[PDB]
Amino acid sequence: ALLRILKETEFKKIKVLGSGAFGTVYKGLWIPVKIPVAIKELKANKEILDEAYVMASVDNPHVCRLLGICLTSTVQLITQLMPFGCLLDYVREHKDNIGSQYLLNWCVQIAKGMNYLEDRRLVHRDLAARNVLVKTPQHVKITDFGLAKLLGAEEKVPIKWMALESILHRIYTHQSDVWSYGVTVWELMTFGSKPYDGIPASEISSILEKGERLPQPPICTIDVYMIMVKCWMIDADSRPKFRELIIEFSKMARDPQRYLVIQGDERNFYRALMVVDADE
Ligand SMILES: COCCO/N=C/c1c(N)ncnc1Nc1ccc2c(cnn2Cc2cccc(F)c2)c1
């Protein structure tokens, strides 16, 4: 069964991870051996089970997969626990130990994961560094795709990560996801800064129309920054394609010190923070 129907007893919400944008995520154990899992708690659930199947049918090393679902009073989404937490918090905590090699590789990995979703005709709708998880320092994965639509994202909100056409018309495409990719990259390059910090969400569409964009990160060469800016063009068709982003950042990954200037570039443990891996 691709989307395993789990019984209220097979798993248990041990601790709390964090209050998300669509629900609360817990850390826990699952017994179909005990497997560490992330549990997100948000008769007509036939609708959900549909968009839920998609989330479980993805198979790419850069995209999290939904492993199970529990349909009771509430819907609980069960996935494999990523021990290092989300990338946003990761870069914030290692702001002085993250080299250009890692930063570029993550951009490549996020780009591959996004290209994979585009091949499945799945618009994420909420890509951001907080929705990129760290399996290990050299392996990151995209998560939380599809939930946005499954709750009326484009029905009658992460404004600062959204493309202009999404804010004004609720239009979501793989190209609006490219814009958010641009913002996600900005978050990594600034080591976790909040985009448009100190600017009211209501004024965002206004500043974007006037041509204003997030500033060039200190460590970025104009070449890296040019890619981000292209991702934020009003004309969605003119923005880079994830496929082109994979190739461009891969190229830069071969000569990192040339595209990112990080002083001393070359040269808390999530054990006490956070049985067999779901992968096992
Ligand atoms: C501020 O710091 C917060 C740190 O929280 N880290 C949390 C977390 C984690 N350390 N490991 C794994 N998942 C984590 N969250 C998380 C994110 C999305 C989720 C679930 C469960 N269901 N869904 C929907 C979904 C949609 C599409 C594909 C999927 F696989 C899952 C859990």
| Beta carbons within 8 Å of 270's beta carbon, 6+ residues apart | 83, 84, 85
255 in any annotated domain: yes
Count: domains in the chain: 2
126 in catalytic set: yes
Residue 47 has phi, psi (to 5 degrees) of -65, -55
Tell whether 214 and 75 lie within a shared domain: no
Distances (CA, A) of 239 to 118, 174, 217, 230, 272: 15, 10, 20, 5, 43
Tell whether 121 and 202 lie within a shared domain: yes
- Of the candidates 50, 59, 119, 126, the residue annotated as catalytic is 126
Instruction: Look at residues 61, 81, 101 and tell me which one is the last residue of a structural domain.
Output: 81
Tell whether 65 and 163 lie within a shared domain: no
* Alpha-carbon gap, residue 183 to 194, rounded angstroms: 10
Residue ranges making up the domain that contains 110: 82-267
* CATH code of the domain in which 229 resides: 1.10.510.10
Distances (CA, A) of 7 to 23, 65, 76, 226: 20, 19, 11, 50
Atom of ligand 1 nearest to the CA of 40: 21
Tell whether 132 and 261 lie within a shared domain: yes
Sign of CA dihedral 38, 40, 45, 49: negative
Distances (CA, A) of 81 to 121, 177, 186: 26, 25, 26
Instruction: Look at residues 63, 81, 99 and tell me which one is the last residue of a structural domain.
Output: 81
Atom of ligand 1 nearest to the CA of 84: 10
Tell whether 194 and 108 lie within a shared domain: yes
Instruction: Look at residues 81, 98, 122 and tell me which one is the last residue of a structural domain.
Output: 81
Tell whether 114 and 206 lie within a shared domain: yes
Q: Whose CA is nearest to atom 18 of ligand 1?
A: 144
Atom of ligand 1 nearest to the CA of 17: 5
Strands of 75-80's sheet in order across: 4-5, 66-71, 75-80, 35-41, 24-30, 11-19
* CATH code of the domain in which 69 resides: 3.30.200.20
Pocket test for ligand 1, best of 6, 67, 69, 77 (most atoms within 8 A of CB): 77
Residues with a CB atom less than 6 Å from ligand 1 = 17-18, 25, 38, 40, 55, 64-66, 77, 79, 81-82, 85-86, 89, 133, 143-147
14 in any annotated domain: yes
Q: Which amino acid is at 153?
A: A
- Resolution given for this structure, in angstroms: 2.3
Tell whether 3 and 121 lie within a shared domain: no
Tell whether 229 and 140 lie within a shared domain: yes
Tell whether 98 and 76 lie within a shared domain: no
272 in any annotated domain: no
Tell whether 136 and 105 lie within a shared domain: yes
